[PDB]
């Protein structure tokens, strides 16, 4: 999705301001929002790819103006409705339609073990690797309206495979109920000049990006 | 000149009420357990943060065999010090050297190694850092007081997949015979993102 979240290479966002001595949570409401994510993922109410794409689909001004955990709050209020877990009315009123019909999967007894374990996207088997480290590759020019992880700034550009990480779930399909379609993910190295041109670049600098096998073709 | 889109802008005045309403709803429906949620918050407020990564770095500095294991398998390496899990399932450690300065970003969102660095600060997840780090890293680093030599390569890693990166910064000169603990005190969060260097004694 060619949305406002795809920031790489954009101008006009200004200085990187940083708060001195920033706490983990700057407001109490942020603690609630942050802790809801693992709870809802544990339920299987949605997967992380769907979660990312839900944020991608929010209004561009909303995305810009919202502080970080407002983006998450948006997902909970909207993706849960899209998935049929909550109704629009429940969300608007804050009042359940019919009592405690579910049971939380994330319980106090399993919090530590679940957070210490996580859920790797690595998979045992998937499409064979077409590329080896050292191969020159070009990123395909694709412009899906749905979820993808090839940033706009890389499309059509030529880089060098520098790491093959092995097999992983494909977010483009997993975000849209089309399965995991596991395939190789590579780190691909691009020169500053290749990405940004002669003027806007520095001779030494390189940008590495992690890209799925079928995002690429031989250069 | 207010903050507008740098991550530190003011939230809506009614945000806490909205959040409370959603929380009550999800609890009433039986979707979430508030006691478990409190444990998640305690975990990221008090238990998981950059002191973890700093221990990893200090150990790699004093123990070349550990450093080698860590660079070969980041996840297994950090697990040796008891660090693991959510948003660090598949870790890759980036060794800075006199020839290469590494730094990472997530241009598409906020991806960051929680088990060793904790939750990211607001600037890391905001558009100024995300947009500019892949195009003008030297200009961004300068804003942090860090000037990389012109002849030193900067490698910017965009965290676009489910690998998570952490930088193993270079050990400061003049720290002969420091214990792991004294070395760890020098290792800042910025030094492990690549946006700063370890404290110089
Ligand atoms: Co991200």
Interface touch A34/B119, C-beta < 8 Å: yes
Read off the tokens for A64.
């810009």
Closest CA to B37 of A85, A25, A54, A92: A25
* Helix/strand/coil for B70: helix
Q: How many CB atoms are located within 10 Å of the residue B94 CB?
A: 21
Resolution of the experimental model in angstroms, please? 2.0
Give how far the C-alpha of residue A200 lies from the chain's centroid of Cα atoms, to the nearest Å. 28
CB contact at 8 A, B133 and B156: yes
The structural domains of chain A, ordered by start, are: 1-118 (1.10.472.20), 122-219 (2.30.30.50)
CA nearest to A36, candidates B148, B36, B89, B137: B36
Interface of A with B in 109-168 (CB under 8 A): 110-112, 114-122, 149-151, 153, 163, 165, 168
Which regions of B135-193 does DSSP assign to beta strands (E)?
A: 153-158, 164-168
Contacts of B129 in chain A (CB under 8 A): 16
**Helix, strand, coil shares, percent, chain A, to 5:** 35, 15, 50
Tell me which method was used to determine the 3D structure.
X-ray
> Do residues A32 and A40 touch, judged by C-beta distance below 8 A?
no
Is B106 an active-site residue? yes
Distance of CA B61 to the CA centre of its chain: 19
Which chain B residue lies closest to A172 (C-alpha atoms)? Answer: B161
Q: How far from the centroid of its chain's Cα atoms is residue A10's Cα?
A: 18
**Whether A141 contacts A156, CB under 8 Å:** yes
Cα dihedral across residues A173, A178, A182, A183: positive or negative: negative
Domain ranges of chain B: 1-201
B4/B126 Cα distance (integer angstroms): 11
Q: Do B158 and A207 touch (CB under 8 A)?
A: yes
- Using a 10 angstrom Cβ sphere, with 0-12 exposed, 13-18 middle and 19 or more buried, the burial of residue A127 is middle
Contacts of B135 in chain A (CB under 8 A): 8-9, 153, 195-196, 200
Instruction: CATH number for B1-201: choose from 3.90.1210.10, 3.90.330.10, 3.90.1150.180, 3.40.1190.20.
Output: 3.90.330.10
What's the CA gap between B183 and B201, in Å, rounded? 10
CA atoms within 13 A on the CB side of A135: 18
Q: Which residue has the tokens 């009420």?
A: B17
**DSSP code per residue over A67-129:** -HHHHHHHHHHHHHHHTTSS-HHHHHHT--SSS-----SS-GGGHHHHHHH----B-S--SPP
Bridge partners, B158 (sequence order): A209, B105
């Amino acid at each position: 999705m060619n949305g406002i979240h795809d920031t790489g290479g954009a101008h006009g966002y200004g200085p990187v301001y940083r708060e001195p001595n920033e706490p983990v949570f700057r407001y109490d409401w942020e603690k609630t929002v942050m802790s809801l994510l693992p709870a809802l993922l544990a339920n299987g109410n949605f997967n992380l790819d769907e979660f990312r794409h839900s944020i991608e689909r929010m209004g561009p001004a909303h995305y810009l103006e919202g502080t970080y955990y407002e983006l998450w709050l948006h997902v909970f209020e909207n993706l849960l409705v899209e998935k049929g877990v909550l109704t629009a009315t429940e969300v608007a009123t804050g009042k359940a339609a019919s009592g405690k019909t579910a049971t939380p999967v994330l319980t106090p007894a399993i919090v530590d073990g679940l957070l210490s374990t996580g859920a790797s996207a690595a998979r045992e088997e998937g499409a064979r690797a077409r590329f080896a480290v050292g191969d020159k590759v070009r990123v395909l020019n694709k412009n899906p309206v749905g979820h993808t992880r090839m940033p706009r700034y890389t499309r059509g550009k030529v880089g060098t495979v520098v790491i093959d990480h092995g097999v992983f779930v494909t977010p483009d399909t997993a975000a849209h109920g089309k399965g995991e379609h596991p395939q190789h993910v590579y780190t691909v190295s691009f020169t500053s000049v290749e990405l940004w041109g002669q003027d806007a670049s520095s001779p030494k600098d390189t940008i590495r990006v992690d890209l799925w096998d079928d995002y690429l073709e031989p250069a | 000149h207010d903050h507008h889109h740098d991550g530190y802008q003011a939230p809506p005045e009614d945000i806490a009420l909205r959040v409370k309403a959603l929380e009550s709803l999800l609890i009433e429906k039986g979707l979430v357990d508030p006691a478990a949620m409190d444990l998640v918050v305690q975990t990221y407020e008090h238990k998981v943060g950059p002191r973890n990564g700093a221990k990893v770095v200090a150990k790699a500095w004093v123990d070349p065999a550990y450093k080698a294991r860590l660079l070969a398998d980041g996840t297994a390496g950090i697990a040796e010090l008891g660090f693991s899990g959510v948003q660090g399932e598949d870790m890759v450690i980036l060794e800075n050297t006199p020839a290469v300065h590494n730094v990472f970003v997530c241009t598409l969102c906020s991806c960051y190694p929680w088990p060793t660095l904790g939750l990211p600060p607001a600037w890391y997840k905001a558009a100024p850092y995300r947009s500019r780090m892949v195009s003008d890293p030297r200009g961004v680093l300068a804003e942090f007081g860090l000037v990389i030599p012109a002849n030193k390569e900067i490698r910017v890693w965009d965290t676009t997949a489910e690998l998570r990166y952490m930088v193993l910064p270079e050990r400061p000169a003049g720290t002969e015979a420091y214990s792991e603990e004294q070395l760890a005190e020098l290792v800042t969060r910025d030094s492990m993102i690549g946006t700063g260097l370890p404290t110089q004694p």
